[PDB]
Amino acid sequence: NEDLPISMENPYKEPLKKCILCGKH
Amino acid sequence: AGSRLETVGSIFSRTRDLVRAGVLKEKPLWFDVYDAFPPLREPVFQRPRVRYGKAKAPIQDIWYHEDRIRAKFYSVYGSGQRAFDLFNPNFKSTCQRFVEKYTELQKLGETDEEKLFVETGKALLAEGVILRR
Amino acid sequence: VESFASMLRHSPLTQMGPAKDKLVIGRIFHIVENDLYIDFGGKFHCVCRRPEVDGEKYQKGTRVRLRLLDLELTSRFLGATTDTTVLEANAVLLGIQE
Amino acid sequence: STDFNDKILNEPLKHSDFFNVKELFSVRSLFDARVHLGHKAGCRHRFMEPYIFGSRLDHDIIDLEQTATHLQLALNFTAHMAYRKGIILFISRNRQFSYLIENMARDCGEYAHTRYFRGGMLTNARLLFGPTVRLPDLIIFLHTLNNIFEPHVAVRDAAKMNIPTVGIVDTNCNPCLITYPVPGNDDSPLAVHLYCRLFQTAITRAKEKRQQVEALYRLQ
Amino acid sequence: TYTEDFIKKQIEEFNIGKRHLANMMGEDPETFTQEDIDRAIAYLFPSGLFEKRARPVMKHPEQIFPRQRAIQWGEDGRPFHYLFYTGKQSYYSLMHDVYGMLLNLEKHGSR
Amino acid sequence: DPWQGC
Amino acid sequence: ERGWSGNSWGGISLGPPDPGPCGETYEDFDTRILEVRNVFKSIRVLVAVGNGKGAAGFSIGKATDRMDAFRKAKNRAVHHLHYIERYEDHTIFHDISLRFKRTHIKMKKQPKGYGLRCHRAIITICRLIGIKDMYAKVSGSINMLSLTQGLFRGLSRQETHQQLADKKGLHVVEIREECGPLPIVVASPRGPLRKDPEPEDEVPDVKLDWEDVKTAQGMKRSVWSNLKRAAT
Ligand SMILES: [Mg+2]
Ligand SMILES: [Mg+2]
């Protein structure tokens, strides 16, 4: 059955936000 | 009268045993009905345990492919200004229209997620659906 | 014959995704002074305070706009192995639906 | 009395669905009644896991394919007990539906107990009601939990008194001692109304069938 | 304790005694009433005792023996009232009625 | 108490 | 007749249970006193009942007077009856090793004519149940209530041959040395029969008791084992 659910990571998860200074020396 | 040891066996097994043993003169009114049409599981008391260590519950999470699309939609165009009507069994949200159109593009063309997203947005604007980023 | 999996996949509640900050339509089905019990299609109703603006139109059977925050309010307390539920959804009453 | 027994009480036990309860519901109707909506995963009871289709954004979904078969069995048992003129007692401590359940019990000619359950109602019935009191032959729980989210004492007491129980069990309920559990939502008014309708219809149909069968037996 | 046959017999004894008292007092037995019974018993058996209960009395048996023993189920054992198993069938029936009226209205020098 | 009396 | 000793309440019969308020009679049931204790005064009595055909139970009764305690215990015991399965209506289906609290009980199925070589309380309860051939050893704390609870628990959780046949979907075949190599089928599955044989475990990983192995090898030397005794 193609209507069955599939194993998956939470697609609605909001990624952790980067801080103002990350990537800067 | 029957045994009051509710934690030993089930009402069926206790009644049957006491009837065959001669303690109960006649079967109760429900006994024949239970015998003809038993339940799927015999109702035996069991103490619920806690799961420790690497024991995880076997319940899965209900995900679908289109959920990914939905996430992107709800992250780019946000929640639609029009409201959800969950009473209507065939309600069709803006995100659901985006999902269906995206699926049509995918089945009628190539597989490039960003290209599918932008082309779906273009076609939805063409149909006359307002979509603010 | 439509199986349960198809129904669940195509259900509006399933399509809604996360319920946080989602605009839904509710119906007032019970009133207790200025407390309105609204059903929006979920498992639990939500109890909303009658607005101070245009409060008279909020009557039984009235259609309202809601911003869902949580479908069921629960929380695990210290020394508890299971969540404690209040059997009620969390939502914000925005107004009447024209 | 042998012919009467054979033709009246033993004939219905020879058929898989004597009262045609399969036509009272379908998976579609149960879905429309929101019977599949369970509690969140944090409130899940372990013994309810085999009845749960999955968790949708942390909300348990009850597998309605299993609910259909369990409801079939429970309705069949209820109809057969009503055909045999057994005393059926409905029990529920959810105050939102007390009036509905009491009206339904009065309507189908059966009994209700939606009020505070005094200790010993079943296990001490001879002291509380009288030495010749007759106890229920079947007890139906529209809600198996009391207001402190622990099991209704009547579940254990009916198990002690060897009275079969039918029950609606949500994802946070304990179905171990219910004879004919029916996994499903017990909170939504639509679902509770559907359950009340189904059980009332089954009981009245079984009683009418009993009357018709006895009338045919006497006439013919 | 007072059995039902016992009280039955007291009922026929009271009725026959009522007819006899009507005979004694010259009144028509058909219309002879309980106030007439009290008056005639007061005349025939005068008593100046201050306690009204201590004075001679000829009542219907139902007025003498309490017998507050109501049957709540038939021969098949089925209770008559659908709220029997609550143990307070009358009180909870009344509460059910009041709640029904409150629901209907919601849809729409004394003590 | 929304279910007063029950 | 006396109990386990001249001055002991244990083992004494109390007669049949009284006819119950439900209206059942119990003339086929016998009651036995297992323990009497002074509670500091009241009396707590542990009694057991049984019809000798697998239906048996036990109960505690507390009362200021001994006879009231006896009556309470007996009447409550008749309403908490276990049914105990018996192999050929004389013994248990298999060996049962159990531990209830700090009391350990080993029970061994025995052939006909072996008799009841058990703790005296176990002998009384077995006579009430209808078990006639069994061996039993009680270790740890000899606590009468724990002994009774463990005995009833283990005897109520024994798997019959039919249960094993249904579970494994195979014939349960009995081999008796007195019957030679003849195979006796004692139980067959009610459903279909598995066509693949059980794995022939070259060495099973069972938990053995040093007591049994020591007796089997002849290294047991106890002067108290296998003493001549009256028929039980
Ligand atoms: Mg619930
Ligand atoms: Mg002596």
Side-chain angles (χ1 to χ4, degrees), chain B residues 2-4 6 11 14-15 29-30 32-34 36-41 43-51 57-64 67 70 87, chain D residues 13 15 34 44-47 49 52-57 61 69-70 73 76-77 80-81 84 86 123 137 156 159-164 176-180:
Chain B
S3 181
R4 305 193 172 199
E6 86 274 9
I11 59 166
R14 265 179 269 121
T15 301
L29 186 70
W30 58 266
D32 306 274
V33 188
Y34 188 112
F37 319 105
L40 292 183
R41 166 202 184 263
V44 184
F45 172 86
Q46 295 297 109
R47 186 180 64 84
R49 293 181 184 271
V50 177
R51 269 182 197 103
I59 306 305
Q60 65 182 357
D61 291 331
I62 297 141
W63 297 126
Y64 303 104
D67 279 311
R70 294 194 185 115
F87 302 100
Chain D
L13 297 181
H15 306 265
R34 297 177 223 163
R44 197 192 291 132
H45 196 281
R46 262 191 81 168
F47 298 159
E49 292 161 337
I52 291 168
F53 185 77
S55 177
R56 177 64 187 181
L57 279 295
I61 300 292
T69 65
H70 280 268
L73 278 167
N76 187 73
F77 192 81
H80 275 285
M81 290 300 306
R84 293 181 183 271
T123 62
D137 306 277
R156 182 192 83 240
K160 284 170 157 302
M161 285 327 291
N162 301 98
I163 297 165
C176 80
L177 275 177
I178 296 89
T179 313
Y180 288 83

Side-chain angles (χ1 to χ4, degrees), chain G residues 118-179:
Chain G
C118 303
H119 193 282
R120 60 192 184 180
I122 300 183
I123 291 172
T124 303
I125 291 158
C126 280
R127 279 194 203 126
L128 288 173
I129 292 166
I131 292 158
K132 294 181 176 67
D133 307 288
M134 200 174 78
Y135 170 78
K137 184 64 178 92
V138 188
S139 307
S141 59
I142 307 299
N143 187 250
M144 186 48 92
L145 190 45
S146 279
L147 182 141
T148 310
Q149 291 210 69
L151 194 71
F152 270 97
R153 184 176 177 87
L155 289 176
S156 82
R157 284 170 195 195
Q158 61 188 315
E159 183 191 46
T160 72
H161 290 324
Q162 189 59 68
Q163 275 161 39
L164 175 71
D166 297 327
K167 174 176 81 135
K168 295 287 198 64
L170 286 170
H171 291 316
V172 182
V173 177
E174 187 178 7
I175 309 99
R176 291 179 183 273
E177 293 179 353
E178 60 271 0
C179 296

Side-chain angles (χ1 to χ4, degrees), chain C residues 16-59:
Chain C
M16 182 179 72
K20 183 175 174 66
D21 314 295
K22 292 302 218 293
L23 280 294
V24 301
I25 305 298
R27 293 180 181 177
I28 303 175
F29 71 91
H30 194 55
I31 297 166
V32 188
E33 293 83 3
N34 282 252
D35 267 353
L36 319 168
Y37 294 67
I38 297 145
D39 176 44
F40 54 85
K43 182 177 168 79
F44 296 111
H45 56 76
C46 66
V47 180
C48 295
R49 277 273 315 153
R50 187 193 302 276
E52 291 83 2
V53 65
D54 197 335
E56 82 275 335
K57 299 294 187 291
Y58 296 86
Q59 295 297 109

Side-chain angles (χ1 to χ4, degrees), chain G residues 1-25:
Chain G
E1 179 62 12
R2 69 169 160 265
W4 301 327
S5 298
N7 196 259
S8 168
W9 277 111
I12 290 181
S13 183
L14 283 172
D18 290 292
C22 58
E24 293 290 329
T25 57

Side-chain angles (χ1 to χ4, degrees), chain C residues 43, chain D residues 39 170 172 186-187:
Chain C
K43 182 177 168 79
Chain D
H39 292 259
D170 217 338
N172 62 342
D186 61 0
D187 304 282

Side-chain angles (χ1 to χ4, degrees), chain A residues 6-22:
Chain A
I6 54 178
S7 296
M8 185 180 288
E9 69 275 16
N10 186 322
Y12 299 99
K13 182 64 69 177
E14 182 65 26
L16 73 165
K17 64 182 181 293
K18 300 299 289 180
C19 66
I20 62 170
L21 263 168
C22 175

